[model samples]
Target: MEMTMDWKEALNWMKENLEAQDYAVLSWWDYGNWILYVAKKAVVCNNFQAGADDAAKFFTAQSEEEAMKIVEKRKVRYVVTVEELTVKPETNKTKFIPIMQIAGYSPEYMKNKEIIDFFNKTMLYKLHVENATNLTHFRLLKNFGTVKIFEVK
Candidate 1:
């Protein structure tokens, strides 16, 4: 079966695959040019999906290598991605603002404590869920509850 799924489905798939939250970031790879060499990581970081242009570059760079070879070489990776940010519907007491979503936050970063407080204070903020199961459950509700893309950062 194909691993590829819809954008939101991909995020849910990630909830099943991610071993650690802070280790990855969600991307929207359907957005722009891939082989813009200049745009490499920035393209992904900025949420642009890799396209044919990037495919040619990836292949040509490795004349006698299979697609997966890049992974062994530590050059590329299959990562978590998402579709778009869906904010909770506005009500009498709500103001929409940008939010950064993150998962499996680093233990070291969690030590700060204040960011969590700030996170909690966002009003629109959702639960600081720690496991993929809960995250998936939360998502299934179609409630996105103050989401991250939902990346959290």
Candidate 2:
């Protein structure tokens, strides 16, 4: 079966858990507005593209060290992601699809390279698809199925 993220519940969780934090949250540009509106929190990027470039760089970074540098630069406290549930393969996907498209890749390539070696090294893959918890600077705080929240240390 297929499922969609519960944005309201996810945002509500952040509101209750991180609303009092001082620093801003990090996420893809699309969901920044929800974090700001419902969670009433500051975000690294918004629909206005304040930190859009940095967000893009962070997610596609090939190593944790590279991703950490952006987190340090942005001074972000929390990282949020909404994973996509694919019924066909019973697998999860992330915003990396659109991110890759933005980088100019063919649809056929995206279909084939979505999770193989090329994507295995990306920070987004580790954080979202793999859900790695033993990262050096990122600690998984919540995993609401399709919605994941990480604390940047």
Candidate 3:
């Protein structure tokens, strides 16, 4: 199934709850600017594409340990991701394509089971689709449908 949420509501929640917090948010570069501008929070990457490589590394990480390592190194307390690249690729292949590009991989797109499985094992799938329930260090803080937030402990 695909996750869904009100985009504006999610932003509002972040603004009202995160304005005074002193921690960096980890998210896709596309949302980085919006997060910084609307929530008044620091972001690892933004429209300028700074720190995008780390963002790609975290999302494409194959294991919880790998993802956790990036979080700790980046000092990321909050993480936000969406389902646009998770379920039903027909509706959101574009979202996943860029991730693959940034991570230096080509999109295989259901062409092979092994490829599909690898994507499933990625942090993006684990966090956004599976809600990171199988992980120990990352805790789901809020689930605004498509827009989910997690805290690294």
Candidate 4:
């Protein structure tokens, strides 16, 4: 016998049967440019090539070579997004004022002790992009939560 059903029905059946199990259901997005999934307790928003295992290894690697080895072994491909900041001409000398206005972050929240401690301990890496040719590289790195992305080779 053969069975066929739409995604909604398939998801319903999976939910009913896989509630106590650990597994992921992946589906294509953007006409197969990426894959999206929902695991038991986590969501896989997008996968370019590598999976979570590779991500774990990459995240733990101490060096780029080690990370790239893992990625190469797993046959993973990745694309990085880079961002640049530009200062606007203004009549104010306050740094936080512009950041607050542009990012919509309240100065009061930024002053909280817990927030200050978190920000102080966190590592943020940034790269500047000058033109469209420099847009392909990802540049931001932040350590704020337990979640991480690893390199897959």
Candidate 5:
């Protein structure tokens, strides 16, 4: 089955664990230093939810194998796959790569390309969501605590 992701659709799903307010939370750190993106793969909870105050809208792990640690930990039925559909940073148009033709995950992290590539030219971004409105995109607000504001329509 194909799934679509947008704040409007993900908000209610998010509320199953978090409050149905207008914001979400994200804190990232691994191997030290702030980076462009911190996660290697995105994993959705396939079986269990509503267990923690903040269960997970989307969970990230260091790698696909590590992500499966979550599946075994939560006892959920899930598979690991990387998103090849990417948006060019300059053009902002959606484009996909042949990374989907292979398996397990994208080839970006085949071995040594891990530093600058993720889930095939994609990334994990932090943003807020609105329960009563449509959110278009996020804008980064830099500070000691960097935040990406979710802009709504």
Candidate 6:
């Protein structure tokens, strides 16, 4: 079957289909982060307590696979954080990367370029969705407590 619809209509149709599957349509505002764009890769935001050995362990793992195994075994909660902002320059408009911080998660641990690239890809997606130029910069905020997750039907 082929169906032609505008963006709004397509969104509404998707919502209805998901509802039929018992999936609730959760608004982005309810979550601390927002998705600005869709990209070819997944963005993984890692969270860990400051001075925690796991942070050191993962940082030393040397690869995404190794770090992911540790994260899974430790049952670490990884939240996807995105920021939406607008920037205006003298000659044109641009998008500025929003500053973010989570208590206990340090950017120092992200010295690994692989992890940094993951975050950059995420920021790129956010900018694309918002129709922005590019991501300027992003950071993880420490001192924020653990995030709680709830399932809604």
- Highest TM-score: give the candidate number: 3
Task: Give the worst 10-residue stretch by lDDT in candidate 5.
Answer: 29-38
Residue 127 accuracy (lDDT) in model 3: 86
lDDT score for candidate 2 against the true structure? 0.72
lDDT at position 19, candidate 6 = 21
Query: lDDT of each prediction vs. the true structure?
Result: 0.29, 0.72, 0.78, 0.29, 0.27, 0.29
- Model 3 vs truth, CA RMSD: 3.5
**TM-score for each prediction?**
0.24, 0.79, 0.86, 0.24, 0.23, 0.22
Residues 3-34 of candidate 1 have per-residue lDDT tens digits of 23353453454455434321223222332222
Order the candidate numbers by TM-score, best to worst: 3, 2, 4, 1, 5, 6
lDDT (tens digit, per residue) of candidate 6 on 41-145: 111222232223443343333344554554555443332212222222332222222121222245455544534444444422322232223322212221111
lDDT, candidate 6, equals: 0.29
Please write out the lDDT profile of model 5 over residues 12-115, one tens digit for every residue.
33334333322223222121111111222222222222322112212223233443344345443212111222224454222222322222345454553342
Q: Please give the lDDT score at residue 99 for candidate 4.
A: 27
Error of 6 at 26 (Å): 4.6
- Please provide, for model 4 over 1-153, each residue's C-alpha lDDT reduced to its tens digit, 9 standing for 90 to 100: 122233334334333543344322221111112112322322222443434334433332334555456445544433121111112234223232332333334546554454334322211111112222222222222211221121112
- List ranges where model 6 is wrong by over 4 Å: 1-6, 30-119, 123-153
lDDT of 1 at 9: 51
Deviation in Å, model 5, residue 58 alpha carbon: 5.1
lDDT for residue 53 in candidate 1, whole number 0-100: 31
